[PDB]
Design a protein around this ligand. Structure first.
Ligand SMILES: *[C@@H]1O[C@H](CO)[C@@H](O)[C@H](O)[C@H]1NC(C)=O
Ligand SMILES: *[C@@H]1O[C@H](CO)[C@@H](O)[C@H](O)[C@H]1NC(C)=O
Ligand SMILES: *[C@@H]1O[C@H](CO)[C@@H](O)[C@H](O)[C@H]1NC(C)=O
Ligand SMILES: *[C@@H]1O[C@H](CO)[C@@H](O)[C@H](O)[C@H]1NC(C)=O
Ligand SMILES: *[C@@H]1O[C@H](CO)[C@@H](O)[C@H](O)[C@H]1NC(C)=O
Ligand SMILES: *[C@@H]1O[C@H](CO)[C@@H](O)[C@H](O)[C@H]1NC(C)=O
Ligand SMILES: *[C@@H]1O[C@H](CO)[C@@H](O)[C@H](O)[C@H]1NC(C)=O
Length: 573
């Protein structure tokens, strides 16, 4: 049997909402989202008390009534993922039985209540709201049972409070995605039970202290996207549980500390977009947990470290925007762990050698070679085989050649981007036979001849990065096959700046998911087929600069297209 004073409180709460909660019978202890425990359980009159109110993802809207603080036996309040807004009553943080507070993913704003007394609280979740001002200075002075604090994705600003050290039982502390600035207070390095520290996406600056070594339970540390500067402290011997470290996008300099090069624990390491100098060095017999390594966009000199294939767990590698001026070492022939490689804009030479070597990597799914090998010849040798390859991107390399047959040795290929090279010849009809291939970018080469009918037959675009065939800026001729209509999964078809001829097929609307359709700058005749009005998702369209004539379809999407996307045609009206 439900309690009197608790029902009054639940009423005020309902009074504050904008819509009624389904499932709320007049006995509230049987209501959905509520849990009761007897007065004598919690220890002459005995009633049900409301210990747990769980409303998550209920599509609720309104303020959060001050009266909710009148349930004193409340243990867990979970409001997550709703539309609630307004401020938080000071009293809502004075509850002495409260264990779990989850307000995350709502519209709450205002200052966050500065006095928090929740002597029983395990969990505090305000993640992703509109709160602003300071993180409460005394926040940790009253939370002796505390485990996780998540303030992330808010407007908190100023420095991280010096009082942060009084939080010594805490394990998870997310401060990420706020307006926080300044140096990290030393007190922070006194929380010794802390296994996750997320400071990412703030204005924080200054040094990263040696004192970081004091947090010896740290498994995951994200300081990325800040103003942090100077050298990365050589502390990694002591942080022996740490598997995830991202310092990406800061002002760090100097070279990587030897202990980081020696970490037994580190798994995902991301240093990208700092300015770090010297030669990349990893002791690959030490770092046996290393899986992802991102050094991209940094000041390194020297060569590509050839000892790297000795890393037995190392799967993905991003070396982009590091200027080596080097070939790929032959030792890469031995890399069995490697699944993903990006050398993009790294000054790599000898694509002939690069591909001879990289093909012996059995497990490589994805290879990004963009902005290297300037004006070199794309290898034509049929015997190169990348069996497990899924993504191949080699773009803006000014590569000379035809589309090579050795690609056919990549049967499982999903994504192929050859755009912005000097490639020529006809588009090979065998491209149509790649069954997994949903993204093809051949644009801005010199290709000639006709679009192969087999493209019309590609398995992945028929039935079950946006799916795209982009042939634009070539010398292509012939007409647009009406069987393009069989591609029901195609989002983008970009044919612009070719010389294509005849009529827009009309069967073109079987393409149910077509979003972008660009035919501009060709030589096309006839009318825009009225059936094209059937493409429900087509946001952007151009036939501009052709020989087309007739009425423009009445449409609605058609009604949206700018004047610009019909211009250049004889008869359009
Ligand atoms: C809040 O409720 C959701 C389900 O609605 C659940 O997944 C989540 O774990 C709850 N939050 C906490 C801190 O228990
Ligand atoms: C790289 O890091 C700098 C310095 O923190 C930042 O200003 C910039 O936005 C970052 N750029 C990218 C592409 O992440
Ligand atoms: C290795 O990394 C994994 C997760 O990728 C982590 O669970 C584990 O703690 C790490 N091993 C060591 C030695 O810390
Ligand atoms: C590299 O690692 C091994 C094993 O951890 C170690 O014994 C060796 O001396 C290290 N070499 C360097 C250059 O630090
Ligand atoms: C390649 O290098 C140039 C010159 O350093 C740089 O400005 C640009 O961001 C890089 N391009 C890409 C897309 O990586
Ligand atoms: C490409 O790389 C290999 C291996 O070092 C070398 O034999 C060859 O001469 C290079 N090719 C050119 C044209 O520089
Ligand atoms: C085509 O490629 C060149 C460089 O390869 C580039 O400068 C140019 O802007 C590109 N043109 C178009 C239309 O994208």
């Amino acid at each position: 049997t439900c309690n009197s004073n608790d029902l009054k409180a639940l009423e005020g709460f309902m009074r504050g909402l904008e819509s009624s909660i389904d499932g709320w019978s007049s006995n509230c202890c049987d209501w959905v989202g509520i849990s009761c425990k007897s007065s004598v359980s919690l220890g002459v009159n005995e009633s049900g008390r409301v210990v747990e109110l769980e409303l998550g993802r209920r599509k609720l809207s309104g303020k959060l009534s001050e009266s909710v603080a009148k349930l004193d036996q409340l243990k867990v309040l979970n409001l997550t993922h709703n539309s609630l807004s307004g401020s938080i009553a000071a009293s809502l943080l004075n509850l002495s039985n409260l264990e779990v507070l989850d307000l995350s993913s709502n519209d709450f704003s205002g200052l966050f209540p500065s006095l928090i007394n929740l002597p029983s609280l395990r969990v505090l979740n305000v993640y992703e709201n509109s709160f602003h001002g300071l993180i409460p200075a005394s926040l940790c002075n009253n939370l002796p049972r505390i485990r996780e604090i998540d303030l992330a994705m808010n407007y908190f600003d100023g420095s991280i409070p010096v009082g942060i050290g009084n939080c010594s039982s805490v394990e998870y502390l997310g401060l990420a995605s706020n307006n926080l600035s300044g140096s990290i207070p030393q007190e922070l390095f006194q929380l010794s039970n802390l296994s996750v520290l997320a400071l990412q996406n703030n204005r924080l600056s200054g040094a990263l202290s040696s004192k970081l070594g004091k947090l010896s339970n740290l498994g995951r540390l994200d300081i990325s996207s800040n103003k942090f500067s100077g050298k990365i402290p050589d502390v990694f011997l002591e942080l022996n549980k740490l598997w995830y470290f991202s310092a990406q996008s800061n002002l760090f300099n100097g070279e990587m500390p030897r202990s980081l090069s020696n970490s037994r624990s580190i798994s995902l390491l991301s240093l990208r977009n700092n300015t770090l100098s010297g030669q990349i060095y990893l002791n690959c017999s030490a770092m046996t947990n290393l899986t992802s390594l991102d050094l991209a966009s940094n000041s390194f000199s020297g060569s590509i470290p050839s000892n790297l294939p000795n890393c037995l767990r190392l799967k993905t590698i991003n070396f982009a925007k590091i200027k080596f001026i080097a070939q790929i070492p032959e030792s890469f022939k031995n890399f069995q762990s490697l699944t993903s490689l990006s050398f993009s804009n790294s000054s790599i030479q000898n694509i002939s050698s690069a591909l001879e070597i990289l093909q012996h990597c059995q497990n490589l799914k994805t290879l990004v070679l963009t902005l290297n090998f300037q004006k070199e010849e794309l290898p034509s040798v049929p015997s190169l085989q990348f069996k497990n390859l899924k993504v191949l991107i080699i773009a803006s390399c000014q590569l000379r050649g035809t589309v090579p047959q050795w690609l056919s040795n990549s049967p499982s290929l999903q994504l192929l981007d050859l755009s912005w090279n000097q490639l020529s010849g006809t588009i090979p009809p065998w491209l149509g036979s790649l069954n997994s291939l949903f993204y093809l970018d051949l644009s801005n080469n010199t290709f000639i001849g006709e679009i192969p009918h087999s493209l019309t037959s590609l398995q992945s675009l028929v039935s079950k990065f946006p799916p795209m065939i982009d042939l634009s800026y070539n010398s292509l001729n012939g007409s647009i096959w009406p069987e393009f209509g069989d591609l029901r999964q195609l989002h983008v078809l970009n044919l612009k700046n070719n010389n294509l001829s005849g009529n827009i097929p009309a069967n073109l609307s079987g393409m149910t998911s077509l979003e972008v359709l660009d035919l501009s700058h060709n030589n096309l005749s006839g009318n825009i087929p009225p059936s094209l009005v059937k493409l429900s998702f087509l946001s952007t369209f151009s036939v501009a600069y052709n020989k087309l004539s007739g009425p423009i379809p009445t449409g609605v999407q058609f009604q949206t297209f700018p004047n610009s996307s019909f211009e250049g045609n004889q008869g359009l009206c």
